[PDB]
């Protein structure tokens, strides 16, 4: 029964929509300024900052030197005549709270909040690869493929925890193991008893990501440590590096900016009755009739801006550039050749040279967003003996399966997880780059609502979005 959850998601999107319309009225924005994605980012950020009860509770008692805690704000980009003018606006957090509740039938409706947070995620992942956090946390800058949802707060519920990657969970746990190595934070203090439950929970999510037995059991051996040290540190890093080949199940949900949902609701679309699903065709559909602008710096390429926002809308930040180009019809260029910077406009840029342009968020085909991490297919699990212990003194060779035994000694370690390491390594030795996953799955035409006819593409350039 998909109509129930489809109707719930639809009600969420309608909440965000009516909310964004009401907000566009509160500011009194033109039809163009309301479709500018920058102002949409400012609005969404204001809503997430207003409902940020942990941040507000930690900012009331200890205020940031910037501004009073009761008020949140952000730059709104307005255009009179032809000139762009950026104005800094401030609104009470309680006011934005009230407007959000009124737009969602009076409920808190945190689901839409987490939706906008995941949208912020996909945009941030598609915009910046955080090499600084990876080198400071002790990880490889070449592991950004696993860094989905790094900007997400741990406050995001199961909906936000599902979209995170293996590397994000590894990093988040590594901050906890590395924090407890300086002082006794795992101590018997109430902070320690609660932090142990946080740690075990995050270990369970990381265990849920992996789809091979060895990885899961290794995570189980990491969680057994009452006081994790450098050993569990290097263990979690080992798991993360294993997630490059033996990948984990990471959810991908197509989350759009609030101006798209708002323009759809303003046009009369009722998402409760019609239904909506992030993994279905609907987002693609909504993007084909979507009219969204974006501010553009002087020498930037508006097509590259459109590609950046497009990748942000389908979580394809770490996808194969070939298959993304096949979905969109136009070439999806890697980040190194993108003649653009972040969609966000800096606080020091002058609006005298700033312009705007239409965003080409359309795609030729469409495809089902997946939760899987591909085909991992290995479990020899032989229980047969492999060496001979001789009893009689007879001239013969003493047989043994040399490949298996000798392969059991590579990657050994003087810790409880040693075995698993070996197995993981062994499993990673069986996988090759050309191992095809998603057998039979293809792309579909936009007029194909029910995925009746797939299109399996044949590929000849580079596949990595980052260098």
């Amino acid at each position, epitope marked *: 029964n998909a109509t129930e959850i489809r109707a719930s998601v639809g009600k969420m999107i309608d909440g965000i929509g009516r909310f964004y319309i009401q907000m566009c009225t509160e500011l009194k924005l033109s039809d*163009y300024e309301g479709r500018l994605i920058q102002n949409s980012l400012t609005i969404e950020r204001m809503v997430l900052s207003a409902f940020d009860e942990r941040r507000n509770k930690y900012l009331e008692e200890h205020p940031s030197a910037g501004k009073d805690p009761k008020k949140t704000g952000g730059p709104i980009y307005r255009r009179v*005549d*032809g*000139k762009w003018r950026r104005e800094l606006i401030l609104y009470d957090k309680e006011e934005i709270r009230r407007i959000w509740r009124q737009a969602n039938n009076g409920d808190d409706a945190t689901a839409g909040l987490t939706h906008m947070m995941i949208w912020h995620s996909n945009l941030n992942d598609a915009t910046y690869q955080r090499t600084r956090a990876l080198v400071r946390t002790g990880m490889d800058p070449r592991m950004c493929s696993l860094m989905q949802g790094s900007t997400l707060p741990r406050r995001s519920g199961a909906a936000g925890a599902a979209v995170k990657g293996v590397g994000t969970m590894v990093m988040e746990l590594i901050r906890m193991i590395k924090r407890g190595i300086n002082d006794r934070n795992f101590w018997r203090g109430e902070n320690g008893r609660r932090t142990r439950i946080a740690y075990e929970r995050m270990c369970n999510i990381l265990k849920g990501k992996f789809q091979t037995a060895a990885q899961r059991t290794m995570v189980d051996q990491v969680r057994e440590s009452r006081n994790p040290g450098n050993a569990e540190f290097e263990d979690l890093i080992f798991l993360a590096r294993s997630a490059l080949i033996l990948r984990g199940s990471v959810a991908h949900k197509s989350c759009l900016p609030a101006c798209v949902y708002g323009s759809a609701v303003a046009s009369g679309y009722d998402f409760e009755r019609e239904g909506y699903s992030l993994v279905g065709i609907d987002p693609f559909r909504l993007l084909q009739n979507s009219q969204v*602008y974006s501010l*553009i710096r*002087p020498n930037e*390429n*508006p*097509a590259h801006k*459109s590609q950046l926002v497009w990748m942000a809308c389908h979580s394809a930040a770490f996808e194969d550039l070939r298959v993304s180009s096949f979905i969109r019809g136009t070439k999806v260029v890697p980040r190194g050749k993108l003649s653009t910077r972040g969609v966000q406009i800096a606080s020091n840029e002058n609006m005298e040279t700033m*312009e*705007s*342009s*239409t965003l*080409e968020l359309r795609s030729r085909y469409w495809a089902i967003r997946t939760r899987s991490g591909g085909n991992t297919n290995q479990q020899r699990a032989s229980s047969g003996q492999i060496s001979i212990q001789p009893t009689f003194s007879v001239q013969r060779n003493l047989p043994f399966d040399r490949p298996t035994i000798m392969a059991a000694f590579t990657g050994n370690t003087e810790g409880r997880t040693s075995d698993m390491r070996t197995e993981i390594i062994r499993l990673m030795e069986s996988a090759r780059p050309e191992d095809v996953s998603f057998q039979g799955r293809g792309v579909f035409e936009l007029s194909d609502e029910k995925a009746t006819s797939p299109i399996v593409p044949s590929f000849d350039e580079g596949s990595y979005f980052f260098g």
Partner: nanobody
Amino acid sequence: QVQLQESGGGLVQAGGSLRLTCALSERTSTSYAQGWFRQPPGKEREFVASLRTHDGNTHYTDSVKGRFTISRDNAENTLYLQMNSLKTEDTAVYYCAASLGYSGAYASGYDYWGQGTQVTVS
């Protein structure tokens, strides 16, 4: 519902001059900017000129600097492209573009187009 009708093209000789005219729809008459692109034979569509409205500034490509001058008519909604010192390199198909917010070289930033008018400079 094509939004821009362009005319004035034809056949001239090197060193001559021509004047391309682009009729502008009511949507297009009041827009952020409008420009001119050219498509040489067998080549991709390249930029020629761009005229902004609120202020009068213009942008030109290096090949036509000085020779070309993109102007606009007052009391009428018509775009003009003055083409002097015409050369064989100028042989192309000239499209009229207009953008709701972009005044720039890239073709991508312009949201309405015409159907060309031939300029052959033999």
